[PDB]
Amino acid sequence: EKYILSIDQGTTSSRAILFNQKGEIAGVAQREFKQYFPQSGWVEHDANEIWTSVLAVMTEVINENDVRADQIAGIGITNQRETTVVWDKHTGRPIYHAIVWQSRQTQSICSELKQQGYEQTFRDKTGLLLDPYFAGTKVKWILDNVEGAREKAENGDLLFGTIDTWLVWKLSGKAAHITDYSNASRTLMFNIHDLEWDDELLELLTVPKNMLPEVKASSEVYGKTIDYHFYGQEVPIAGVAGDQQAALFGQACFERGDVKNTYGTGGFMLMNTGDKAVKSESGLLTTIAYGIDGKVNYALEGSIFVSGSAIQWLRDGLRMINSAPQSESYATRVDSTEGVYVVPAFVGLGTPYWDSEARGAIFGLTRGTEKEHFIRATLESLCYQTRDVMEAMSKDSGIDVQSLRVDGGAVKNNFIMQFQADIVNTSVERPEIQETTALGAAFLAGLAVGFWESKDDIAKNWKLEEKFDPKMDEGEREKLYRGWKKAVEATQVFKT
Amino acid sequence: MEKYILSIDQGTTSSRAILFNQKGEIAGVAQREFKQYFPQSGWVEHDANEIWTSVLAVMTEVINENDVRADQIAGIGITNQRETTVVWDKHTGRPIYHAIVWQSRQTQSICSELKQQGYEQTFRDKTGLLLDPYFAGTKVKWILDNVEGAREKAENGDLLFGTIDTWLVWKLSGKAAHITDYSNASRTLMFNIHDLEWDDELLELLTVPKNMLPEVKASSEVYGKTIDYHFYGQEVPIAGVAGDQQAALFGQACFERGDVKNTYGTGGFMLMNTGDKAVKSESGLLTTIAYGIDGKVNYALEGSIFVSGSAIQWLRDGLRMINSAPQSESYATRVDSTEGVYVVPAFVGLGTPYWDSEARGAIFGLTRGTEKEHFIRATLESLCYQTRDVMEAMSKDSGIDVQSLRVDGGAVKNNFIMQFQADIVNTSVERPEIQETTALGAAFLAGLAVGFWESKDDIAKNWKLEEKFDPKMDEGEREKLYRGWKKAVEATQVFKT
Amino acid sequence: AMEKYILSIDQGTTSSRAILFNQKGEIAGVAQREFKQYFPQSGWVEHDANEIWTSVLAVMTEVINENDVRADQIAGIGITNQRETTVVWDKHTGRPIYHAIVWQSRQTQSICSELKQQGYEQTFRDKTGLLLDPYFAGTKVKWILDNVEGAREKAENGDLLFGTIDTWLVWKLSGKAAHITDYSNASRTLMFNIHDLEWDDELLELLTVPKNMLPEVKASSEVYGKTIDYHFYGQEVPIAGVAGDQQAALFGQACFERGDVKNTYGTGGFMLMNTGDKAVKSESGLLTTIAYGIDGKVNYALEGSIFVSGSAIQWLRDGLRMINSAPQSESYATRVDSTEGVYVVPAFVGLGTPYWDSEARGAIFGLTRGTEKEHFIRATLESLCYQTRDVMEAMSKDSGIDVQSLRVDGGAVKNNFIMQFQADIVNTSVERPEIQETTALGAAFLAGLAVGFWESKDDIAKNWKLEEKFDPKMDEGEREKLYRGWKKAVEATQVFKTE
Amino acid sequence: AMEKYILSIDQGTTSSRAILFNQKGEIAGVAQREFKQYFPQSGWVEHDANEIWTSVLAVMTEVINENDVRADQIAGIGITNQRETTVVWDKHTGRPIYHAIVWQSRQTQSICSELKQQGYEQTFRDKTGLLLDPYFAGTKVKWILDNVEGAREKAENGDLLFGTIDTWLVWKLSGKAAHITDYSNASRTLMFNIHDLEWDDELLELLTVPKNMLPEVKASSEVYGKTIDYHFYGQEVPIAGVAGDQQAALFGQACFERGDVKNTYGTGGFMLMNTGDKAVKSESGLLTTIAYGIDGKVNYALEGSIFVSGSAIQWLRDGLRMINSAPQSESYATRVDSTEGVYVVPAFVGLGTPYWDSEARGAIFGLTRGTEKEHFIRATLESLCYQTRDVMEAMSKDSGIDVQSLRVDGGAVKNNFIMQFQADIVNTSVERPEIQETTALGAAFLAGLAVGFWESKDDIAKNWKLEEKFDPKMDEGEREKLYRGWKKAVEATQVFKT
Numbered sequence A: 001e002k003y004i005l006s007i008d009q010g011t012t013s014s015r016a017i018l019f020n021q022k023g024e025i026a027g028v029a030q031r032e033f034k035q036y037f038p039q040s041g042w043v044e045h046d047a048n049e050i051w052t053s054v055l056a057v058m059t060e061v062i063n064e065n066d067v068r069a070d071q072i073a074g075i076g077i078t079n080q081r082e083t084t085v086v087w088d089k090h091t092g093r094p095i096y097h098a099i100v101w102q103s104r105q106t107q108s109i110c111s112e113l114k115q116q117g118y119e120q121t122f123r124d125k126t127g128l129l130l131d132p133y134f135a136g137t138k139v140k141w142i143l144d145n146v147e148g149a150r151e152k153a154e155n156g157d158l159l160f161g162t163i164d165t166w167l168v169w170k171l172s173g174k175a176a177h178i179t180d181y182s183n184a185s186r187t188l189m190f191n192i193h194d195l196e197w198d199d200e201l202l203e204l205l206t207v208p209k210n211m212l213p214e215v216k217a218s219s220e221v222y223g224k225t226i227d228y229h230f231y232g233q234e235v236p237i238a239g240v241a242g243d244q245q246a247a248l249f250g251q252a253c254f255e256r257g258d259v260k261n262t263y264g265t266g267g268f269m270l271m272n273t274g275d276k277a278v279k280s281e282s283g284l285l286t287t288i289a290y291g292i293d294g295k296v297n298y299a300l301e302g303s304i305f306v307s308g309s310a311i312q313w314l315r316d317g318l319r320m321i322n323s324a325p326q327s328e329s330y331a332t333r334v335d336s337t338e339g340v341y342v343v344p345a346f347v348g349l350g351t352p353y354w355d356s357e358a359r360g361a362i363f364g365l366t367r368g369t370e371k372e373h374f375i376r377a378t379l380e381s382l383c384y385q386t387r388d389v390m391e392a393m394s395k396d397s398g399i400d401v402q403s404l405r406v407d408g409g410a411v412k413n414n415f416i417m418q419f420q421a422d423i424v425n426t427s428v429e430r431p432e433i434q435e436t437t438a439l440g441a442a443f444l445a446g447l448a449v450g451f452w453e454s455k456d457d458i459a460k461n462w463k464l465e466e467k468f469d470p471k472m473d474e475g476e477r478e479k480l481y482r483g484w485k486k487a488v489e490a491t492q493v494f495k496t
Numbered sequence B: 001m002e003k004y005i006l007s008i009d010q011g012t013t014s015s016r017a018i019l020f021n022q023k024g025e026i027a028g029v030a031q032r033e034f035k036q037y038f039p040q041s042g043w044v045e046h047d048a049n050e051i052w053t054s055v056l057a058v059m060t061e062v063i064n065e066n067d068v069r070a071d072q073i074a075g076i077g078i079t080n081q082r083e084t085t086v087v088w089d090k091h092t093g094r095p096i097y098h099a100i101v102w103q104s105r106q107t108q109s110i111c112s113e114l115k116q117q118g119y120e121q122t123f124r125d126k127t128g129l130l131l132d133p134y135f136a137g138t139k140v141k142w143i144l145d146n147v148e149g150a151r152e153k154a155e156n157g158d159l160l161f162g163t164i165d166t167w168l169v170w171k172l173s174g175k176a177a178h179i180t181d182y183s184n185a186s187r188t189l190m191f192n193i194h195d196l197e198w199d200d201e202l203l204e205l206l207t208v209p210k211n212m213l214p215e216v217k218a219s220s221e222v223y224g225k226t227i228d229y230h231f232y233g234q235e236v237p238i239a240g241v242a243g244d245q246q247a248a249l250f251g252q253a254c255f256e257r258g259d260v261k262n263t264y265g266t267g268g269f270m271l272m273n274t275g276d277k278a279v280k281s282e283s284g285l286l287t288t289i290a291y292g293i294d295g296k297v298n299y300a301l302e303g304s305i306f307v308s309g310s311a312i313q314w315l316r317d318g319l320r321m322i323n324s325a326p327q328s329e330s331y332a333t334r335v336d337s338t339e340g341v342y343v344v345p346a347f348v349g350l351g352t353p354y355w356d357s358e359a360r361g362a363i364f365g366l367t368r369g370t371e372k373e374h375f376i377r378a379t380l381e382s383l384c385y386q387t388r389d390v391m392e393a394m395s396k397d398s399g400i401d402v403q404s405l406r407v408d409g410g411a412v413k414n415n416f417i418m419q420f421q422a423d424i425v426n427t428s429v430e431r432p433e434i435q436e437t438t439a440l441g442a443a444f445l446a447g448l449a450v451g452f453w454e455s456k457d458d459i460a461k462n463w464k465l466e467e468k469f470d471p472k473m474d475e476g477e478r479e480k481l482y483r484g485w486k487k488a489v490e491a492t493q494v495f496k497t
Numbered sequence C: 001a002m003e004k005y006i007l008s009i010d011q012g013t014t015s016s017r018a019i020l021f022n023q024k025g026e027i028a029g030v031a032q033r034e035f036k037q038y039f040p041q042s043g044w045v046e047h048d049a050n051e052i053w054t055s056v057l058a059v060m061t062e063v064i065n066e067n068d069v070r071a072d073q074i075a076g077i078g079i080t081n082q083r084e085t086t087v088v089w090d091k092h093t094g095r096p097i098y099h100a101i102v103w104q105s106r107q108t109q110s111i112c113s114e115l116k117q118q119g120y121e122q123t124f125r126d127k128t129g130l131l132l133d134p135y136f137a138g139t140k141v142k143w144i145l146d147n148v149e150g151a152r153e154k155a156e157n158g159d160l161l162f163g164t165i166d167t168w169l170v171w172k173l174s175g176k177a178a179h180i181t182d183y184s185n186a187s188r189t190l191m192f193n194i195h196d197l198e199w200d201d202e203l204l205e206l207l208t209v210p211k212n213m214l215p216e217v218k219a220s221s222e223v224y225g226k227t228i229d230y231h232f233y234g235q236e237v238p239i240a241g242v243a244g245d246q247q248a249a250l251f252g253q254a255c256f257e258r259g260d261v262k263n264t265y266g267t268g269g270f271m272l273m274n275t276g277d278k279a280v281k282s283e284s285g286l287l288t289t290i291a292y293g294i295d296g297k298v299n300y301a302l303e304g305s306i307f308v309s310g311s312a313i314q315w316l317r318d319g320l321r322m323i324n325s326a327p328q329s330e331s332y333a334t335r336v337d338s339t340e341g342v343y344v345v346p347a348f349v350g351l352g353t354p355y356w357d358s359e360a361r362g363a364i365f366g367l368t369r370g371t372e373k374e375h376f377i378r379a380t381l382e383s384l385c386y387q388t389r390d391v392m393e394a395m396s397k398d399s400g401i402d403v404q405s406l407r408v409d410g411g412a413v414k415n416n417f418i419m420q421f422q423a424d425i426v427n428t429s430v431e432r433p434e435i436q437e438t439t440a441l442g443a444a445f446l447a448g449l450a451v452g453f454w455e456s457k458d459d460i461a462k463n464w465k466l467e468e469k470f471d472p473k474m475d476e477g478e479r480e481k482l483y484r485g486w487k488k489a490v491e492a493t494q495v496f497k498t499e
Numbered sequence D: 001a002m003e004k005y006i007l008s009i010d011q012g013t014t015s016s017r018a019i020l021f022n023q024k025g026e027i028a029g030v031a032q033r034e035f036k037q038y039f040p041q042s043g044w045v046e047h048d049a050n051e052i053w054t055s056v057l058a059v060m061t062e063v064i065n066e067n068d069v070r071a072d073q074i075a076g077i078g079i080t081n082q083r084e085t086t087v088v089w090d091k092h093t094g095r096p097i098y099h100a101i102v103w104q105s106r107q108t109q110s111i112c113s114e115l116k117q118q119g120y121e122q123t124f125r126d127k128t129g130l131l132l133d134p135y136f137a138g139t140k141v142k143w144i145l146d147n148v149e150g151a152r153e154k155a156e157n158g159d160l161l162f163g164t165i166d167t168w169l170v171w172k173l174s175g176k177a178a179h180i181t182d183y184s185n186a187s188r189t190l191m192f193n194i195h196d197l198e199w200d201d202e203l204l205e206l207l208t209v210p211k212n213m214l215p216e217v218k219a220s221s222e223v224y225g226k227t228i229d230y231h232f233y234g235q236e237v238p239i240a241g242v243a244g245d246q247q248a249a250l251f252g253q254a255c256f257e258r259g260d261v262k263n264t265y266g267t268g269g270f271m272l273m274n275t276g277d278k279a280v281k282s283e284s285g286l287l288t289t290i291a292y293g294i295d296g297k298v299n300y301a302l303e304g305s306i307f308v309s310g311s312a313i314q315w316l317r318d319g320l321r322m323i324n325s326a327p328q329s330e331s332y333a334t335r336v337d338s339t340e341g342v343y344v345v346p347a348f349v350g351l352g353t354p355y356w357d358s359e360a361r362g363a364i365f366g367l368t369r370g371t372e373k374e375h376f377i378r379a380t381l382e383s384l385c386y387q388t389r390d391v392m393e394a395m396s397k398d399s400g401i402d403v404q405s406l407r408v409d410g411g412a413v414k415n416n417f418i419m420q421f422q423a424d425i426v427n428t429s430v431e432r433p434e435i436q437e438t439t440a441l442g443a444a445f446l447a448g449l450a451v452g453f454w455e456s457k458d459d460i461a462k463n464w465k466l467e468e469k470f471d472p473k474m475d476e477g478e479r480e481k482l483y484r485g486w487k488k489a490v491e492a493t494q495v496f497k498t
């Protein structure tokens, strides 16, 4: 009996999942790694700790689930997008921390180009915009701030790569330095319209072309694992794609109209737009969904920087709760937040505001406000934000979603699901297997090595765990939303 | 068997009773809290009956547990939370509704009504206040309008209005006296601080009969004696009433003009004795009576802050984030800065100098790296930023420049706050050895009345410095922080449903 | 708005309470207040008498002012209280010469030992129906007279007055007009002869306590006097009821006839059984004391005492700061199916019925690494029950009667888990009344019946209504298994005794 | 430059640790990773053999990366471990057939009672230098073979292998090349005759354990083989050191001959004394076991065993959720002048030296209404000290020697209160080392010397640096009173049994 090992290197933890022929989870292993906040707005990881974590979950899932390494037909790698890494080709070590997709430490770089009118250029080519959110400015940051980098890059001693690249490069023993369309399209360097590194964007980002990896399809055998990194086995690595794109795939969203929403560190709703890249006029991102079978699908994306990450904050920042699940208890202990709103713009505001300078704020507080209200308010933010992007997309698409499929870590919190159904007046469908990112990447690989004959097995296996129906008249609905919007304005007013 | 003067400070969240010996020292202290009711957002109400029983409790407590008999009490001094209104049936002797607290924003509409009819300017020239839900007047009309049967009764002479002083003195004297003093009267919005009498016009606008009103009196004067049964068989003279903040002013020796002090309690209040000439303000400060004594009446400029220490108390009761108020200093000093975070505790709107009833509490500058220590520190700092706002507004209206400010109140104990205050305002902060000046002020008003003390001077010659905090930060860092503060406030006023 | 009410004051070990009662026997208002519990040394337990007075004075002011009831509508006052707690004060100044020594205190131990070693324990039993334990007032008095500087000089000049809480309250509240007590309270002083119904001159000499400090014993339902005006809002309301808190509970439970039994779960756990009017002698560790004095008659009863019951749950809260509130313990207990070998013996101040071991202290057993916080709390909650059973079997012998359904009351009866477990571990039905504060209800009637606010005591029975009956629900094997472990815990607990 | 290192793995009862030692004997890196503890039924303690492996494999990876050191810079590997803890796996699939039974578990009580009732206890004492307590490996294997379905018949077909953690780790790490154990670890199995040095046939039949499952007993400092490339980043580094954690700590403290005594405060408390090559029989509840095999020599030792020491604080944390971290405990304890009569006897898994009572369980005494966290927690911390004194005196009488300055180490030795009270309660100075992770240091040297990284063991004696000494500051009066009470608390504890 064979299996497909999937690695989901997320923003706050790494995960290894085994899938049997039937598309069931044969095992799961998870390890968190440190998050660094050196200065307000900044967010960084330690590339070496990420590697060792991914290397850890693998070893774990194999041992704890009684399955040989020689039973892995293939490996799929899906990851936190944009997070940049720059290492020494030879010593194989990062020359500096990985600047996470959330970090605002490249703001000035953006402001420079933005002030030179180049934003429009980046929008027309990358389908993105000039926000510190994307890989491009992070490389430039490293080459301009990290001593020696500039000259090491000129001597062809350095390599760039988003997490997908970083992992595959290490796992294959430096055999392959590649990335797929989806990941590449989130770098501000890749021209998503002609599908190739844009020379102009590179010069404009003062980034050498020798550091870039080869851009390949999302379901292809990029190589094999080196024996010592996989228990003496050379297992093929045949799947790569950004976590959210892989989730899209995992939800069986293969053509126009298909929309899904993921609640992880951040909140991300993507819609498959087929092979016709669609331009957004409401603050959505135009990006590549995935490359498979000679085709290249595009998609519209709505990005929320902080979603579940706001609960983690309640836990690690304010030490107000011990675990994410505990939050629900408080939230369900009060009829409402009684006027209190929480805008988690910890790293600016994404779709549709796109405000890098905005920071987390809280409003409507009164002597009577207590934990229950405060925590509940935080939980509700994941919903108010989803609506923000949901309506923004409903207008750039014209399509009107009526039953959204969800997934991610936070989707198991029932209050969040019901309140989401209510606040949007739409049904929310939660799957039996909520780890769709993992599942998605597993298929990109399984299909590439013939573990599965067709992607449709995914649509067929999808099982609804529970649907959530709206239970809140307009009266209250729009009142609450009306207030959220005011809360978001006020947030934007606070800037120094 | 030496005697003592009993002071009662009926504050916003607790009642206190304090004994004082000839030497002006504390012979004993008793405190006791009472429920704060928040029926709706912005609303604040107390149970007038629970306030009475609490006052009655602390008294019993302070004498029984300090080996001091009731017969050794030369006089009683009563100072209190201002504006809090109580409307009760003269006959039954019990309130017809919770006392509406000074912080309450439930009389908002009423204040708007009058504004839209263009009366605000009238109230300013007469009361020296303005049309904010902060003052008594509107709270009375509110009751008369919203409490079933309230009017039928109010117009039969069956009801009596009263701010806490009037309520306490009336009950304690066994219904013998239904009086108030100038200081308390000036905060009702129905008293003309220039004519020193109730204003018949203001009363008609607030649709408040003149029969419910108590008679204004001096601050130091024997208003009557406590009925035996509410004071252990004795008939002790009640000879001292005055708003809690004014009392603090008097207990700080701020007698002459230009004298300024700041109290850090549930709220933050900065009064400046303007002598005997009510100075007009154009920076958001109030004009009100300091005290009535020696046949004279002093005026003063006030800077008011609805939520100060109350914010720290919220970290405890609300977010159940700290065990005790003083436990906050622990966290604050654990991290070097707030790192961008600010806290604007407009739980019940903003006072001096913004005066925004609609405003609410908000927090800014948050990031994933924001830890619990930063959040609490930003709260402790807000008491200071707020004090600065008030201080600059007064520096203008008075033209005077404070080089060293005297302080008092429950929160002064916290050294972090005291130092940060001195830094952010760039002025020396002086903390007295006996910080409960409010209770000590009421002591002397009573004492001086019953001739327990010769002169008020004693307060000055007996006052002693506990510690003086002096500024210790650069100019750049100063304005940078204050710049963000104002931004925070600015943003906070934008959020209005 | 012109009905009258009866004010009941229950001055308990950890809190004071004031409760109003209408003609219909319903609660017209309730006011509670706590007071500091002093523990100067291990086993010592003391209150500040002054603080008790001011607390009683507080709940009164509170109950009338916040229930819209004037003082002039109070037909009478009932005063029931924590027993044994001794107070010694100067008649003149009117204030105590030392903290009140609570009934739990073990600071008078040596004194009890001395008397035992002189072979007097049998004497006190035949006379008081008690025994030489630091639990009763007598020894506490001598303790003060012996250890408080100048105590003797003054005690022998008539300058001092002894009194258990009832005496202290009535004296202060009556403005020094009455220095009395009733039979129920008196029988717990160790100086009162429960057979001759009078102070025993011999017992007093042994305790070296002058007869001039003693108050005069009276019936339980009788107008002892009127409250002085200034301590009751200008009114002179009659004080017409006094009786030990537990007895009151017995009366309020309608346990008037012989064979009647009830159990109270408060600071301690007390099981009284009205033995009619014939003091039954015990040989299983139960006490013999006066139930009440009413209608010209005097009833007796057998008592099973437990020093620490709900006080153990209160210890989880104040001591180990392990739970937020008492009722928050049920949450944990029901979270785990069993204690998994763990047992808690709360002999904080020794063991009462049926062990009577002053030297014993609290102990916990059956611990393992797997022992979680839930199990620990559950083990504490369960001890209230085990202890109840120990007392129950001892009484089943001394009376030969078999309880098939026990009535209960007290602060802890609210906790369902404890109720069910009691019903199970004892294998008997437990009945929880709708009005669980029977102790104050009892004091109410003693007063009311005196001042003629009610015709007969029968009303207490006709008006009593069941809230819920708990019925046994576990096998025989499991029952005894648990109880066998309990006794083992107890057995070991008595083995730990330092010098 | 071209600098080498010695990787040391310390597989402890509650966590696995990897430590790098440079030529100078300094720590070049540390990595720790806790693993789950299972308490299926009261008294039972078990670990998941696989999770243990994946943890050790984890700490290795971490220490190497985080500390920027190449795998090819490792001169050698040393493995030290939690003793007695048993593991039984399939020779072929390399999978344990059931959880590892931890040294603490009491789940083999009935087995002990059987043999104990048949008079065989004296047999085991005379041969193993131990006794019939569920604390040792022997009964655990039998438990597995008798209770785990299929085990019996798999063992008869030679499909199963036995091994204490050291063996398990070396067998996995070396790719099944080596299935060995050293003297120290072996001498804690109830199967190894410590007097003639070999698996005792009688004891084996008597434990119904096949001889084909037993590994080879080798010296404590010898190259047992190499790591397979895939379990060590493509490198085949030599595995040249094995020894029970406590023995390794003895060696680490520079206790090489008679008189040398140390005490470790980890999950459990263990004091060992080197008795040279003459195995000394104990008459006061101590254990006679092998210290280590090195240079053709095989030193013996006297050991005092306390099942629960630091493990009692962890309990306050995980069990009662009374504190958030072990270190926090001190805060409370230092906040009161005494426990005011409260005692805590953490017999969570029976009592060891010198009481040896498998039935005993944790108990608490001296409680009153005035007892509060500070007193409760402080009492717990003090138990670590009282228990040490129990064995200290028990050893001072079997040895005749009188210790007057004990060297200490372990996870709980960084808690000053515990060190000062210990000095006080015993009336002896307590010396705390700079490097308190001596177990790792010791194992590292067994390896390092085996591969020639170091020429002699004396380097250990010379590098030892005293971090802080603690002197007694408590008159007999109070001293003897407190201990007197402790003893009573222990008696009372033994009374509670069902």
Ligand SMILES: Nc1ncnc2c1ncn2[C@@H]1O[C@H](COP(=O)(O)OP(=O)(O)O)[C@@H](O)[C@H]1O
Pocket (backbone or CB within 6 Å): A009, A010, A011, A012, A013, A263, A264, A265, A266, A307, A308, A309, A310, A311, A312, A324, A325, A326, A327, A408, A409, A410, A411, A412, A413
């Ligand atoms: N029960 C829960 N309730 C609320 N939030 C949760 C819950 N479980 C996990 N989360 C949140 O989900 C996030 C982790 O989800 P995941 O999709 O694994 O992250 P990522 O997208 O970074 O891979 C965390 O930020 C966590 O706070």
Ligand SMILES: Nc1ncnc2c1ncn2[C@@H]1O[C@H](COP(=O)(O)OP(=O)(O)O)[C@@H](O)[C@H]1O
Pocket (backbone or CB within 6 Å): C011, C012, C013, C014, C015, C082, C245, C265, C266, C267, C268, C309, C310, C311, C312, C313, C314, C315, C326, C327, C328, C329, C410, C411, C412, C413, C414, C415
């Ligand atoms: N819900 C509850 N669960 C368990 N114990 C309780 C609960 N409520 C109150 N208790 C306990 O009951 C006791 C209260 O005693 P009470 O019956 O009021 O009279 P007294 O104070 O005279 O003993 C306290 O010790 C308290 O811990």
Ligand SMILES: [Cl-]
Pocket (backbone or CB within 6 Å): A335, A336, A337, A338
């Ligand atoms: Cl809501």
Ligand SMILES: [Cl-]
Pocket (backbone or CB within 6 Å): B336, B337, B338, B339
């Ligand atoms: Cl700051």
Ligand SMILES: [Cl-]
Pocket (backbone or CB within 6 Å): C337, C338, C339, C340
């Ligand atoms: Cl149980």
Ligand SMILES: [Cl-]
Pocket (backbone or CB within 6 Å): D337, D338, D339, D340, D482
């Ligand atoms: Cl001690």
